[PDB]
Structure formats: structure tokens, C-alpha cells
Amino acid sequence: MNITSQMNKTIIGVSVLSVLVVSVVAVLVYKFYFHLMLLAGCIKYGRG
């Protein structure tokens, strides 16, 4: 761990760390996506 050179080890750690971040990233992106709408239409309009 804590490496990023031309070593098989780094290939595993990096590949794994990436898969995690990527997943979590899109996860909240779509998951929270709904929350946004709920927060947006949480209060009626007020053009005045």
C-alpha cells in the first residue's frame, strides 16, 4: 500500500482503490440525485 510504481502490487492496490472511489462516486451521484429534486421542490414558488 501507499505506492504507485511499476510493481504488480501497486497495480492491485490502485486498481482496487479506483474501483471503490468510482463506485461510491456514481452511487451518490444517482442516489443523491433524487434528494436534489426533493430539496428543490420542498417549497412552493414565489415569483411575486
Swiss-Prot record:
Transmembrane regions listed in the UniProt entry: 10-30
Induction: By LPS in plasmacytoid dendritic cells.
Localization in the cell: Cell membrane; Early endosome; Cell projection, Ruffle
PTMs per UniProt: Likewise, mutants lacking two or more of the other N-glycosylation sites were deficient in interaction with LPS.
Glycosylated position list: N2, N8
Tissues in which the UniProt entry reports expression: Highly expressed in placenta, spleen and peripheral blood leukocytes. Detected in monocytes, macrophages, dendritic cells and several types of T-cells. Expressed in pancreatic cancer cells but not in normal pancreatic cells (at protein level).
Function: Transmembrane receptor that functions as a pattern recognition receptor recognizing pathogen- and damage-associated molecular patterns (PAMPs and DAMPs) to induce innate immune responses via downstream signaling pathways. At the plasma membrane, cooperates with LY96 to mediate the innate immune response to bacterial lipopolysaccharide (LPS). Also involved in LPS-independent inflammatory responses triggered by free fatty acids, such as palmitate, and Ni(2+). Mechanistically, acts via MYD88, TIRAP and TRAF6, leading to NF-kappa-B activation, cytokine secretion and the inflammatory response.
Quaternary structure (record): Belongs to the lipopolysaccharide (LPS) receptor, a multi-protein complex containing at least CD14, LY96 and TLR4. Binding to bacterial LPS leads to homodimerization. Interacts with LY96 via the extracellular domain. Interacts with MYD88. Interacts (via TIR domains) with TIRAP. Interacts with TICAM2. Interacts with NOX4. Interacts with CNPY3. Interacts with HSP90B1. The interaction with both CNPY3 and HSP90B1 is required for proper folding in the endoplasmic reticulum. Interacts with MAP3K21; this interaction leads to negative regulation of TLR4 signaling. (Microbial infection) In case of infection, interacts with uropathogenic E.coli protein TcpC.
Similarity remark: Belongs to the Toll-like receptor family.
Domain notes: The TIR domain mediates interaction with NOX4.
Additional notes on this entry: Ni(2+) may cross-link the two receptor monomers through specific histidines, triggering the formation of a dimer that structurally resembles that induced by LPS. This process may be the basis for the development of contact allergy to Ni(2+). A mouse model of contact allergy to Ni(2+) in which TLR4-deficient mice expresses human TLR4 has been proposed.
Name of protein: Toll-like receptor 4
Gene name of the encoded protein: TLR4
Whole-protein coverage range: 623 to 670 of 839
